[PDB]
Amino acid sequence: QPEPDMITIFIGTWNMGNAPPPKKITSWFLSKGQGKTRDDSADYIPHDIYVIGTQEDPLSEKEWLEILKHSLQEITSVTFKTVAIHTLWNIRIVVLAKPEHENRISHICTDNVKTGIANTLGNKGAVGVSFMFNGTSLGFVNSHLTSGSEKKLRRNQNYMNILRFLALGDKKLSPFNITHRFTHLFWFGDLNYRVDLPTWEAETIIQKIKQQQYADLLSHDQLLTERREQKVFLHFEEEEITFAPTYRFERLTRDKYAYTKQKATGMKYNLPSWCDRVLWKSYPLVHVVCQSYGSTSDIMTSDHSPVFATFEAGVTSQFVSKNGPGTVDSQGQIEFLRCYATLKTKSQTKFYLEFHSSCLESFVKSQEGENEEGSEGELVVKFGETLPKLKPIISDPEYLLDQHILISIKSSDSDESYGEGCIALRLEATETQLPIYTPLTHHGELTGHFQGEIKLQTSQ
Ligand SMILES: Fc1ccccc1NCc1cc[nH]n1
Secondary structure, eight states: OOOOSEEEEEEEEEEOTTSOOOSOOHHHHTTOSEEEOOOGGGTTSOOSEEEEEEESOOSOHHHHHHHHHHHHHHHHSOOOEEEEEEEETTEEEEEEEOGGGTTTEEEEEEEEEEOSSGGGOSSOEEEEEEEEETTEEEEEEEEEOOOSTTOHHHHHHHHHHHHHHOOOSOTTOTTOOHHHHOSEEEEEEEOOOOBOOOGGGHHHHHHHHHTTOOHHHHTTBHHHHHHHTTSSSTTOBOOOOOSOOOBOBOTTOSSOBOOSOOGGGTSOOOOSBOOEEEEEEEOTTOOEEEEEEEEOSSOOSSSSOOEEEEEEEEOOOOOOOSSOSSSOOTTOEEEEEEEEEEEOOOOOOOEEEEEEOTTSSSOEEOOOOEEEEOTTSOEEEEEETOSOOBOOSOOOHHHHTTOEEEEEEEETTTOOEEEEEEEEOOOSOSSSOEEEEEEEEETTEEEEEEEEEEEEEOOO
């Protein structure tokens, strides 16, 4: 039985509004309703992995797992295996996989982050799951961020706390946060960003939704505008939104948005908004294609509609050669020529690099770079031709060209990372000097750039 080079992944996010679900929720897992929906001809084809994020979930883990498994079995006839389940308060993530994947999945991690302080600590935060699928690392984050139209900055802060403190994936990747630890990272949930239009325009917005005219609403969506201004979710992707706002509905219909201020809302307006979202970030030049992104129309127990997204995702096999794992393959090498980091820092420490990759036996520390002043104020750290030659465990180009090198630039004085990035080895040529580039981030904010040339030697 061949190992796959693609899988499909289902991502669901649903704020259940503290109410039990209806008896049938199959439309969610079938990607049917509004938006980019899945073709009927695929309905019996199971996804490889289903990742379900809930918020305001009133069920026990047992109760929800029974509903989810029975739903998938009804659709597909397949009895899915439970990979992981993790709950923080009423925020939950479930990962289910086809039984044939059970011996492909390993290194399962779970964690949570509680956001806020005192007043604002006790119900918002995130849960996550990571694991290896053969040679490919997968991370999943379900976050319930701060509510309210006038709290976009708090949401952005919540995002930065979650990506700093959620402890998933390979702990040896110590300079790297979750935005660099995974081949594919999916971040979803009740992100709670709102359509920023005046309260007086509520009925106009409702009109627009009834006409399926979302352009003048999406142009005011806080997540899209904050992302455009590089305030949040830097280097993440989101599929175009083609479904109606998923909040805030009257329960038991989808015919009415309930936006007016009430004691139950803290006297806040809830204008129709795309609270419920799926974003992703994959390593450079890895296959990832969104094949659905939409909301259900027929699940009406909550004041939110469920959101689905599905993806094709490239995966790699657990490679064995005569040599690596457990030695190097001297027919393989990675050279960095004429490299330099450009940093936004005002500091004047010396810097060194660390190169981290599962194609290396362990991470590699460089010599200190040479600091120069850039024309427009910046720090330029030059490495010249001084960088250590990297010795991969396997030289086979079918393996090596699919790998990635994580780079951290660290202060000699403090050993703290000032920036992290990633270089693909999916080159146009081997034995050829080729340009490389990554932005550098720290705590998910832009801190600089790394650029230079690479020369990759494979066994071919
Ligand atoms: F979210 C982004 C990342 C990169 C470039 C652009 C965007 N959003 C554009 C937008 C703003 C309001 N509606 N659409």
